[PDB]
Amino acid sequence: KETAAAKFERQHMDSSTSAASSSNYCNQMMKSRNLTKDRCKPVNTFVHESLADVQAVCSQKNVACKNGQTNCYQSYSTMSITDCRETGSSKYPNCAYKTTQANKHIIVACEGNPYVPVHFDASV
Numbered sequence: 001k002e003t004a005a006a007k008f009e010r011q012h013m014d015s016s017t018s019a020a021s022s023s024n025y026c027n028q029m030m031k032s033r034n035l036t037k038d039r040c041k042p043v044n045t046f047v048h049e050s051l052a053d054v055q056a057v058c059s060q061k062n063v064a065c066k067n068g069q070t071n072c073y074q075s076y077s078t079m080s081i082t083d084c085r086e087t088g089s090s091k092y093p094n095c096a097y098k099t100t101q102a103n104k105h106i107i108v109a110c111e112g113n114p115y116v117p118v119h120f121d122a123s124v
């Protein structure tokens with residue numbers, strides 16, 4: 001079965017300098033990573049940093065998660081990311097997305113032992 005740590009990687013890690021694709025990056029990625037499979041996942045962020053730099057976030061700035069838990073962590077440096085946000089007219093199984101490139105500080109929830117990222121909470 002898929003670990004929560006592996007799920008975070010499948011859903012969010014795209015180690016590159018920035019978004020590369022042949023066609024709209026979110027439409028392609030959201031699909032290739034299985035995020036359009038049982039529903040159009042409505043919002044999702046990919047991170048173009050090494051796994052190691054992202055994992056390191058778990059021992060950086062502790063912040064409250066959006067859901068009230070306290071195991072969220074904010075990166076000290078900005079990271080290169082891409083937000084995928086589903087369009088108005090997008091409708092499962094015909095998922096379509098707006099692609100927005102950014103450099104922001106990322107916030108993840110970390111869990112387990114090893115204590116690694118498992119959810120993407122926000123960017124700031």
Ligand SMILES: [Au+]
Pocket residue numbers: 007008011012118119120
């Ligand atoms: Au996630």
